């Protein structure tokens, strides 16, 4: 199972994900990126059924980019999140549904930082923090215990480290490294990988 | 004038000008002769040459083991009809495990080519054909036209100046049945030669032959293989 996590601060959004690509019992790739850049201020974290994640994420990415080309400005995180849900829900009762779980992080000029949680059935929910996968069962309570709405980005990174450390000690799966990114008013920034 | 643009428009004299114009296409094509005996069916076509450096445009085509055809008029239409005939023959072998009787195949060509003479915006096939074949009822020579009518003939000629080839065939047709293969082809070459202008002659570069019979699959003779049939002709 893959792991996703998002923490929203007063003026930024912090996201992280495991970099393991697996085939049955073997880790085929240990530095796989699960984040997709839709626009300058929007990141799409996607996990789930093999094949579906990339096909779906790329489809969204191409449509988000097309919107910007046709209008001259980027779609906001909220509009992008709803566009993603609409599409996911449309394929829900079709012959080819997309079994994917995702998080949409973004920064809107007027609205600020946003974090969106979406399950495979296309239910959309805005949240201060969220996680996906089996690991979410061991880390959600940790976020509940230490998270405050005015948490700074330095404290957020420490909070993320706490969650990832818990996975190292409690989780049965081997997830040694994580991609860490932050989105704010200056765009998407790559932070150092958190490795164990 | 106002009655010669569409195929769906009947003229006041009870004619369809577009179909008559499509018959003109067949008349300008190089002549081809088709005759038969009691055992064989022969197709002889005068291969025309657009240039002095180009090859002679093919006229005789294999359709099936027992059926061969010669075309005069629009080449595009000929290929379309030949493809249709080939498919009909293939269907017959796939479903009934036997060769499609020639007469039934000609009937199928007739109905297919009639459809476009009654529909607005469609045009008639601008090609005439000579169909040689051999089946249970013997050897056959059929002739199709752009107006979807077809004829069963003892001998026939179509194309430019084929009237004189038909004139020749009319007087020599009496001794066609008893005629053996070799002499039957001669009668065919002689009739085809009549359509040519005095100077020009039948060589191995402009004469293609097609033969089918009692114990012979339809075979096309071109270039050096037609030599034997030509050599010894007064």
């Amino acid at each position: 199972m893959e792991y996703l996590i998002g923490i929203q601060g007063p003026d930024y959004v912090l996201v992280a994900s495991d970099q393991v690509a697996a085939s049955s019992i073997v880790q085929m790739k240990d530095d796989h990126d699960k984040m997709f850049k839709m626009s300058e201020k929007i990141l799409l974290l996607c996990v789930g059924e093999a094949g579906d994640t990339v096909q779906f994420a790329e489809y969204i990415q191409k449509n988000v980019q097309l919107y910007k080309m046709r209008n001259g400005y980027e779609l906001s995180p909220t509009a992008a999140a709803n566009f993603t849900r609409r599409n996911l829900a449309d394929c829900l009762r079709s012959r080819t549904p997309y079994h994917v779980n995702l998080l949409l992080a973004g920064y809107d000029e007027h609205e600020g930082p946003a974090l969106y949680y979406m399950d495979y059935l296309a239910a959309l929910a805005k949240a201060p923090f969220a996680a996906h996968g089996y690991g979410a069962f061991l880390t959600l309570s940790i976020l509940d215990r230490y998270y405050t709405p005015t948490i700074s980005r330095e404290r957020a990174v420490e909070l993320l480290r706490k969650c990832l450390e818990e996975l190292q000690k409690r989780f049965i799966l081997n997830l040694p490294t994580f991609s860490v990114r932050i989105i704010d008013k200056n765009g998407i920034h790559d932070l150092d990988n958190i490795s164990f | 004038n106002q009655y010669d643009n569409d195929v769906t428009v009947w003229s006041p004299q009870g004619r369809i000008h577009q179909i008559e114009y499509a018959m003109e296409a067949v008349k300008q094509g190089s002549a081809t002769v088709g005759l038969k005996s009691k055992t064989h069916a022969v197709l002889v076509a005068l291969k025309r040459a657009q240039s002095e450096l180009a090859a002679h445009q093919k006229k005789i085509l294999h359709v099936d083991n027992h059926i061969g055809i010669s075309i005069a008029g629009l080449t595009a239409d000929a290929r379309l009809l030949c493809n249709f005939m080939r498919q009909e023959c293939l269907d017959s072998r796939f479903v009934f495990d036997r060769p499609l009787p020639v007469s039934r195949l000609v009937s199928l060509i007739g109905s297919k080519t009639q459809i476009p003479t009654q529909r607005y915006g469609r045009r008639p096939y601008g090609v005439g054909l000579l169909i040689a074949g051999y089946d249970d009822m013997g050897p056959h020579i059929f002739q199709t036209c752009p107006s979807a009518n077809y004829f069963d003939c003892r001998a026939m000629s179509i194309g430019a100046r084929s009237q004189s080839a038909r004139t020749y065939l009319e007087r020599h047709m009496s001794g066609f049945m008893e005629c053996n293969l070799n002499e039957l082809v001669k009668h065919g070459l002689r009739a085809l030669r009549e359509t040519l202008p005095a100077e020009q002659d039948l060589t191995t570069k402009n004469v293609s032959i097609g033969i089918v019979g009692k114990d012979l699959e339809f075979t096309i003779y071109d270039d050096d293989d037609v030599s034997p049939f030509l050599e010894g002709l007064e």
Binding site: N71, S76, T78, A79, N82, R86 | Y120
Partner: protein, 242 residues
Amino acid sequence: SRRYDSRTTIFSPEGRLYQVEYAMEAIGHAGTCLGILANDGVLLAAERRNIHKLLDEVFFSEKIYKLNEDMACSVAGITSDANVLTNELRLIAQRYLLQYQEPIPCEQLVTALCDIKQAYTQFGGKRPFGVSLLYIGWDKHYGFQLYQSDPSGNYGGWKATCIGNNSAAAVSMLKQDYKEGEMTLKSALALAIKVLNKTMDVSKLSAEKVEIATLTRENGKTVIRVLKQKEVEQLIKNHEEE
């Protein structure tokens, strides 16, 4: 079939589209429609053609149609053709809202309708829609906006513009009276009346001969309203004293 085909979507010898030009001729004789953009809102002023005494009044207006929560439009040309396009505009706006959960930006709505108009002039064999439109709206990207589109599928943004009867003369007046970035709704309403008085040829302007709609932002929400006879009558009075 070919004998009766009018061939509505073909190029003429000098590269012109006759049906499109003929539809523009029809729009030129229709009721006058004028749009003016101000700093605190936009307005639409249209001359009424239905003025018969036995006519009844029971709709929102005559030439002004609300498209969504933040947009309105005015039409000039074939009335029944305008009904078709106005209904289509409403659907386009609702479809955008269903997909992104946000109101469609003004310019995006105009562009979508212009695509439908362009399609009629290129294929299909049908006569084009004989309508010209004026759009007024507010969105979060560019605030207050004003657009005008025509039968060919072309459109453009304007500070002040006019379509319909005597629009060329109305545009001239606007050029010498519109102050870029120094206009207000009250000052725009006066200009509208002034311009409308000149283009119209019936001496007394009259409140019954016109229809005026304004679009403003009130407490974080767009407000679109058609001025009542009293307000319009008062505006005409002002011009007399003006």
